[PDB]
Design a binder for these strands. Structure first.
Ligand SMILES: [Mg+2]
Ligand SMILES: [Mg+2]
Ligand SMILES: [Mg+2]
Ligand SMILES: [Mg+2]
Ligand SMILES: [Mg+2]
Ligand SMILES: [Mg+2]
Ligand SMILES: [Mg+2]
Ligand SMILES: [Mg+2]
Ligand SMILES: [Mg+2]
Ligand SMILES: [Mg+2]
Ligand SMILES: [Mg+2]
Ligand SMILES: [Mg+2]
Ligand SMILES: [Mg+2]
Ligand SMILES: [Mg+2]
Ligand SMILES: [Mg+2]
Ligand SMILES: [Mg+2]
Ligand SMILES: [Mg+2]
Ligand SMILES: [Mg+2]
Ligand SMILES: [Mg+2]
Ligand SMILES: [Mg+2]
Ligand SMILES: [Mg+2]
Ligand SMILES: [Mg+2]
Ligand SMILES: [Mg+2]
Ligand SMILES: [Mg+2]
Ligand SMILES: [Mg+2]
Ligand SMILES: [Mg+2]
Ligand SMILES: [Mg+2]
Ligand SMILES: [Mg+2]
Ligand SMILES: [Mg+2]
Ligand SMILES: [Mg+2]
Ligand SMILES: [Mg+2]
Ligand SMILES: [Mg+2]
Ligand SMILES: [Mg+2]
Ligand SMILES: [Zn+2]
Lengths: 120, 51, 98, 89, 138
RNA sequence: CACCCCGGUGGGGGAUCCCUCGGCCUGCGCGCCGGGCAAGGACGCGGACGCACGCGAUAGACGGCACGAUCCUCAGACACGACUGCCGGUCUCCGACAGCGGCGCAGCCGCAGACAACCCCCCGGACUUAAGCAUAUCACUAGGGGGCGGAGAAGAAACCAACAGGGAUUCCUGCAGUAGCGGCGAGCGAACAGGGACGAGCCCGCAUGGCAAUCGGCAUCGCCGAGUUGUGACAGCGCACCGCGAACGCCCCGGACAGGGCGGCCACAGAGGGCGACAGCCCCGUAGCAGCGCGCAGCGGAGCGAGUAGCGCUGCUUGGUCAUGCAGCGCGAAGCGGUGGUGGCGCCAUCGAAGGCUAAAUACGCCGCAGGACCGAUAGCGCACAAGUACCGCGAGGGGACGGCGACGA
RNA sequence: UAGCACACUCGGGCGCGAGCCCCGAGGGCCGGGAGACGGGUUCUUCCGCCAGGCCGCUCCGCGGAAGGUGAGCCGGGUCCUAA
């Protein structure tokens, strides 16, 4: 947690792409020092994890950006649709299940639900 | 046998790096009931099925 | 055609992904001093132009030849010969390989 | 002849690594795995009641299924970044 | 009696819940009673023990000793109090592990946001006592 | 002296007993896979990392939120959040294509593969019983193939009946081990009722002709397409959902008090677990306490089902008997037809097949939860342990063994 | 107990320890060296051993720590077909 997420929200998506490449370089210099010399035990750990932290903030900013790009799209990208289940994505909608023929509409309209109470 | 496919050598390398004792710092960990690696494999007694 | 995958990861093939480190072995030192050759331990799926392009990019030196060998210890050892003379010794002190 | 002498000739290896199931059961001549039945599309009908316990669903990592159990438990709210964006609009 | 069917009275599941408790639950299970001087101020019966807590030992060999908590270890459930020690053979003094139930807190540490956590339990206890007072009023 | 027997001490071995983060059983809950790349696999990923487990090049805690001080073998990390929890990201490669299919189709989609307990469709044994055996039986089972779903299938009478008539299906009870089938041998074997659970009903086709009133697609209010070989209709949903929880001291024994003794206290809490012996009052807990809203609009209604029904033959099936069902083949209907335990014909009675949908009661493994007159390490699952592991087999496959110091302070 | 090395011998060395380990000498004996399949690190170096090797070991295909496999020309694929 050497690189904090608070600073990564300020950077842009392509600015996080360059940061992950720059942090990958420093990890290669750390893996050099681990082989040749000693290192503090979690230096490779920390630099590996803030590469992941930069890339996560990159992904989280990119999901937010791509959603507002293709929000009012006819077909949104599959990334931005909710991954329910293949069966649940192929389910009929509640509007489609409520679809009934004209005779069922007229009958429910002409004979609606009654609210009543009985007593003997 | 000095001629092998890419899959054979990767499986042979994975069998080789696996075949090592418990690192000695693990014997000092609490709740470490393992004293020696029981899954050690010797090349003459135990055969690998890497064909 | 709408894009099906809107949020895409950055591509691989970064030079830090390809090169794990440069070796400081007794063999690797002999190759640095006698043969102007660095020894890098690399990703086992990295090809010879990808390894050579990584050394020209990360260490900023021209590469004559790349010899590779997938080790039985799991990695790919890559022998990178540099173009200019005395240059692998110049890299390995600045890169800290030796 | 029939026994100890004949075992010296057993240096062929007929069943090699299957690319689908990873057992050493893919025959080279037959070009079919004896365990999982690759390259038939459906899995081979397992030859024992215990073979499902060894090789069936749940005996492996269940990488997608453990995720979809966790999403189903929470109501399939999905991607946490996109969840707040659909909630705002 | 326990009238909640959804909680276990099973010994096996309660024992498994104790030894395979996670670290958030193991902090709660390592609670310790307060003194009467702390309970007039805070009101709650006990609180989870922490490092730098002043503690009087209530049971065991060190009973009646006072000292600060110098080490809490959630796995194996042991609180190590300053001035509750035993020597090794090489003269090295080791703190002796005491269960948290055998310790009574004399002075609560309040440094690392713990005064917020004490006041959160204190206020929720005070608020829940107000609801039970109104319900018994009605 | 050896040998033998008995005892003592020491071995040897792991019985016994005590324990149990395990099993088993029952109930309840859940019932959610897959080109958005599944199941499974391969290979990698820890500073020191083999196994196990975790994970996927964001590789041994990446983000958000909650939590709030430790994690630890070393080194270190840590209020700029340790250890955790919940959810989400990332999620290599092999493994679902000679692909197949739908839609005028700049293109957009679907199928494949997994699951095999439950359920539906097809295929279909033999051991066995008959004291042999061939029909029969086992059995319309096992098994194989195919296919779904959270249930499935069934289902709104071409039904039951013979009454003073009942009224979809499914399930229970019951009819009933009955009528009946059967080398009438062994054996097999239903149905209507009556009682009950649960309850629910509907639709397509022959829709206007003063104009397809209908739909799909798009780069969209306009094109293009479907379509007259005929298209056409909205009543149901959603959110919220806590944190706290009473009451104990002294003395004795002891390594240690939860023991003993004395004296209290709390209890809508004396369920259970932990704590150095057996704790209502030491701890975790336990009893106890908290809800709501938003919706429902219109325009046809007598439409009717053919290589079918039925008959003949055949094969299978059934308790189904001069045929119960199913199929094949031959023949092949009707305006009236089907049926009436099932020969033909006639009566009378009762229904309307050959098109479609339909909750609930019903079944059930994994898994989650809770229980139990269960088993307590040769038992109980094969596995209380680095168990589908080690290991064996060319292969399909086969498959173990192994639990316990203490106050984890010395 | 059955059984297990019985063409070697002499001196020296390291070593707590030597019939077997090393060196020198003598006397004998027979294959040795390259590929495939198969094995998979056994290779090589350093250190070890009171465990394993049908005896012993200071040795080792053993135990531990390392090191090592570099290709336009070798083999296969990026080629071709055979049954
Ligand atoms: Mg080979
Ligand atoms: Mg062998
Ligand atoms: Mg990536
Ligand atoms: Mg090469
Ligand atoms: Mg041969
Ligand atoms: Mg062959
Ligand atoms: Mg005796
Ligand atoms: Mg035993
Ligand atoms: Mg169960
Ligand atoms: Mg995947
Ligand atoms: Mg994190
Ligand atoms: Mg399928
Ligand atoms: Mg039988
Ligand atoms: Mg018989
Ligand atoms: Mg008999
Ligand atoms: Mg017979
Ligand atoms: Mg399903
Ligand atoms: Mg249905
Ligand atoms: Mg029968
Ligand atoms: Mg119409
Ligand atoms: Mg309390
Ligand atoms: Mg016919
Ligand atoms: Mg009639
Ligand atoms: Mg009759
Ligand atoms: Mg009908
Ligand atoms: Mg026992
Ligand atoms: Mg057992
Ligand atoms: Mg054999
Ligand atoms: Mg002898
Ligand atoms: Mg000889
Ligand atoms: Mg050779
Ligand atoms: Mg050697
Ligand atoms: Mg020895
Ligand atoms: Zn296979």
């Amino acid at each position: 947690m050497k690189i904090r997420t608070l600073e990564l929200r300020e950077k842009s998506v392509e600015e996080l792409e360059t940061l992950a490449f720059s942090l990958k370089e420093e990890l290669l210099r750390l893996r050099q020092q681990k082989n040749t010399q000693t290192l503090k035990p979690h230096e490779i750990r920390v630099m590996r994890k803030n590469i992941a932290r930069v890339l996560t903030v990159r992904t989280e900013k990119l999901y937010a950006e791509m959603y507002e790009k293709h929000k009012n799209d006819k077909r949104m990208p599959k990334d931005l649709r909710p991954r329910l289940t293949k069966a649940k994505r192929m389910a009929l909608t509640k509007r489609q299940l409520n679809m009934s023929v004209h005779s069922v509409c007229k009958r429910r309209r002409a004979y609606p639900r009654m609210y009543f109470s009985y007593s003997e | 046998g000095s001629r092998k496919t890419e899959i054979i050598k990767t499986r042979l390398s994975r069998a080789l790096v696996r075949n090592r004792p418990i690192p000695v710092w693990k014997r000092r960990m609490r709740g470490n009931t393992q004293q020696y690696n029981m899954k050690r494999r010797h090349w003459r007694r135990n055969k690998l099925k890497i064909y | 055609k709408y894009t099906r995958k809107a949020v895409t990861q950055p591509a691989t093939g970064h030079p830090a992904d390809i090169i794990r480190f440069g070796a400081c072995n007794e063999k690797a030192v002999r190759l640095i001093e006698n043969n102007n050759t660095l020894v890098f331990i690399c990703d086992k799926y990295a090809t010879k132009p990808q390894i050579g392009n990584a050394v020209t990019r990360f260490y900023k030196v021209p590469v004559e030849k790349v010899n590779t060998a997938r080790s039985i210890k799991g990695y790919k050892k890559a022998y990178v010969k540099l173009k200019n003379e005395g240059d692998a010794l110049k890299i390995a002190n600045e890169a800290g390989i030796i | 002849s029939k026994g100890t002498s004949s075992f010296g000739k057993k240096n062929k290896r007929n069943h090699i690594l299957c690319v689908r199931c990873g057992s050493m059961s893919y025959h080279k001549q037959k070009l079919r795995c004896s365990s999982c039945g690759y390259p038939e599309k459906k899995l081979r009908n397992r030859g024992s009641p215990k073979a499902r316990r060894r090789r069936g669903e749940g005996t492996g990592r269940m990488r997608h299924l453990k995720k979809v159990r966790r999403a189903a438990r929470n109501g399939f709210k999905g991607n946490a970044i996109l969840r707040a964006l659909r909630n705002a609009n | 009696m326990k009238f909640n069917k959804e909680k276990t009275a099973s010994r096996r599941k309660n024992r498994k819940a104790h030894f395979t408790a996670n670290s958030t639950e193991r902090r709660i299970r390592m609670s310790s009673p307060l003194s009467k001087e702390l309970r007039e101020k805070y009101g709650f019966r006990s609180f989870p023990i922490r490092r730098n807590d002043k503690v009087v030992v209530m049971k065991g060999r060190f009973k009646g000793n006072t000292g600060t908590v110098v080490e809490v270890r959630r796995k194996m459930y042991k609180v190590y109090v300053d001035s509750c020690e035993a020597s090794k053979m090489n003269g090295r003094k080791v703190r002796v592990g005491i269960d948290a139930s055998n310790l009574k807190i004399i002075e609560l540490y309040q440094g690392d946001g713990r005064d917020k956590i004490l006041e959160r339990k204190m206020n929720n206890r005070r608020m829940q006592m107000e609801r039970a007072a109104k319900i018994k009023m009605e």
